């Protein structure tokens, strides 16, 4: 059946441009991670992760989705577990898991030790501060 509207119809020079889907499409579940930060590599060609940028952190905050936010930042990227001393709250503790022995040289502490889950980038950050002479101490309880 005819269209009630008549139609503008004729030849017109068109151009096919460099951007085509199959060169852009990208998807990744638990691929390879970087050496330094231990977070996903950058680039579709290296099977990389997309960036959860801090603007998107903002959006997830405004939504109130706290645990999805912590999920993106920890389990989907460079979660890590370190052992820290219960008095000098620093990642100094020598922990052998096979033999169940945790120690803190200098402090002489072997019984007040904790383990905690932080990003590996965060473990980095604190090690870099220590190399910078600043002592980032982390304590389990308020005091």
């Amino acid at each position: 059946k005819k269209l009630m509207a008549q139609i503008f119809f004729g030849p017109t020079y068109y151009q096919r441009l460099r951007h085509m889907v199959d060169d852009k499409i990208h998807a990744r579940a638990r691929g390879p991670m970087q050496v330094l930060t231990r977070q996903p590599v950058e680039g579709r060609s290296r099977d990389g992760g997309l960036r959860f940028g801090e603007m998107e952190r903002d959006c997830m905050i405004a939504h109130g989705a706290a645990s999805f936010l912590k999920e993106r930042l920890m389990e989907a990227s460079d979660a890590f577990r370190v052992h820290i001393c219960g008095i000098c709250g620093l990642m100094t503790v020598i922990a052998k898991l096979n033999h169940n022995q945790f120690e803190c040289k200098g402090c002489d502490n072997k019984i007040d030790i904790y383990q905690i889950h932080i990003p590996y980038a965060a473990k980095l950050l604190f090690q870099e501060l220590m190399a910078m002479n600043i002592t980032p101490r982390l304590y389990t309880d308020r005091s």
Binding site: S67, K70, I118, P119, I134
Partner: protein, 203 residues
């Protein structure tokens, strides 16, 4: 004024005459207020209640400045000292107090948004100007402003001047509360945001 040439003749009672001339030309005020370099008469079609009660348009003459001296202009006869207004909300803070500040700050933000035909709900800009004014005076949203507060340490360094904040934290031996959200996202912990503003336990 009748004579068609307007002349003033001044003798002292020769180079210092040039200094008297410079003083005269530059630093004598004939009239007016110290910073008001221009003034214009406009008409505003303000609406006001009629004696019958319904509102009506009662246009009024208003003068618009090209400069600001709030203190001295406000103390002038013939004007309404309760209705004076400037778009320099910081002068308002200095003369009429912090709360008048807040009100004018909101008015100017509201005007920059509504200028473009946009509308944003009162509470959002209200919160903005409340946080800017909740301290003594006017705190800006840039590195000199909110970011030199007592806002923990790690949250502070997540905006600007990162490593200097960290160094000052080392030196002053700051203790971080770890209730800021940026703190918890840094430690990969659940921040006290809507889902984590409370604990769950069983019956």
């Amino acid at each position: 004024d009748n004579d068609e040439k307007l002349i003033i003749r001044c003798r002292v009672v020769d180079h210092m005459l040039k200094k008297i001339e410079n003083t005269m030309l530059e630093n004598i005020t004939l009239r007016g207020v110290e910073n008001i370099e221009r003034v214009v008469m406009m008409k505003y079609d303000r609406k006001v209640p009629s004696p019958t009660g319904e509102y009506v348009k009662e246009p009024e003459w208003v003068l618009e400045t090209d400069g600001v001296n709030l203190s001295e202009v406000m103390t002038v006869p013939g004007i309404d000292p309760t209705r004076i207004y400037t778009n320099s909300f910081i002068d308002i803070m200095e003369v009429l107090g912090i709360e008048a500040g807040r009100a004018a700050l909101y008015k100017e933000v509201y005007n920059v948004i509504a200028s473009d035909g946009s509308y944003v709900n009162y509470r959002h800009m209200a919160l903005l100007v409340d946080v800017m004014t909740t301290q003594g005076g006017l705190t800006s949203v840039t590195r000199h402003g909110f970011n030199r507060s007592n806002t923990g340490a790690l949250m502070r360094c997540s905006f600007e001047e990162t490593v200097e904040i960290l160094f000052e934290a080392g030196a002053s031996a700051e203790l971080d509360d770890c209730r800021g959200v940026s703190e918890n996202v840094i430690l990969g912990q659940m921040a006290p945001i809507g889902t984590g503003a409370f604990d769950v336990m069983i019956d």
